[PDB]
Amino acid sequence: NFMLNQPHSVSESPGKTVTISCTRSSGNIDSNYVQWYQQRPGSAPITVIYEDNQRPSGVPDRFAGSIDSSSNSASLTISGLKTEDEADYYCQSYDARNVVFGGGTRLTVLG
């Protein structure tokens, strides 16, 4: 079963852009769909990206999902950072039917 590896922490100021990466340990990142979840303390993991790059209704266009087959990774890019964006972000994919989660990246919005 492959692993998904992401950095534990990222930081940036409001209005800026951050990128959070998620590297797949074995096989190809494009073999299975990648989902991104946003989780604040007290909430369930909330889908912000599904199927690599699709946003659910209500999720602002500031959130963008991408896949880089060359680096075997998935990226979540958040532009125009707002304080509400401070949260842990988890990538997630599937090994057959089995759910695989990355370790999460905590985004700190400075100030």
Describe this structure in words.
- By secondary structure, this protein is mostly beta strands.
- It has one domain: Immunoglobulin-like, CATH 2.60.40.
- It has no helices and ten strands.
- The strands form two sheets. Strands 2, 4, 5, 8, 9 and 10 form a six-stranded mixed sheet that branches. Strands 1-3-7-6 form a four-stranded antiparallel sheet, with no helix packed on it.
- Strand 6 (63-68) and strand 7 form a beta hairpin.
- The radius of gyration is 13 Å and the shape is globular.
- The termini are far apart.
- It is classed as immune system.
- Keywords: Light Chain, amyloidosis, immune system.
- It forms a monomeric assembly.
Furnish the topology, listing elements before pairings:
Layout (H helix, E strand, L loop, with lengths): L3 E2 L3 E4 L5 E7 L10 E5 L6 E4 L13 E6 L4 E6 L8 E9 L2 E4 L3 E5 L2
Parallel strand pairs: 2-10
Antiparallel strand pairs: 1-3, 3-7, 4-5, 4-8, 6-7, 8-9, 8-10
